[PDB]
Amino acid sequence: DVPSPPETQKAELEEGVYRIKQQGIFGKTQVGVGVQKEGVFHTMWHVTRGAVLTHNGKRLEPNWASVKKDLISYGGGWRLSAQWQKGEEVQVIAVEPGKNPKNFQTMPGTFQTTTGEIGAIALDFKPGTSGSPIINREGKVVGLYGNGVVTKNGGYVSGIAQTNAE
């Protein structure tokens, strides 16, 4: 903690799920997805690599970033407080490039670590879906989709990427 914390521009976005677009080869394309909640925009670190977001004539810098957790928030600290509970089904609001958002329901498995346990989503969406929210039956975001592993048989399994709310 410090006496005079620095200030970034506010994420002036309505709550909801957003496509994140980047200028690249071929022009502007959807690189990933993010979730605006309580004035803070949340996505996966690998999607933006901490780049500035621009909206409403304002340049938005990340307020919190962790490469290790693969998560990043703009406009403030992490606000997604919900946790996945083992044995409960979730939905992913998959926002694929060029497609209408669609909800997919699944029962997560688990990834094992010496640290602890992380939910595992065996769903394989198109590139550009990273940052799509994983939600519980209350409509709360328990994590973000898109940091995963390719299994020996070519199947994709995503972690449920989450951190504690500030």
């Binding site: 677009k21 977001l53 939905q91 329901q105």
Partner: peptide, 20 residues
């Protein structure tokens, strides 16, 4: 510099696609 565009609201859909 990245831009954003709204695509959806956060909702559980009772007839979402099964199954994962």
């Amino acid at each position: 510099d990245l831009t954003v565009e709204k695509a959806a609201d956060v909702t559980w859909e009772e007839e979402a696609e099964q199954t994962g």
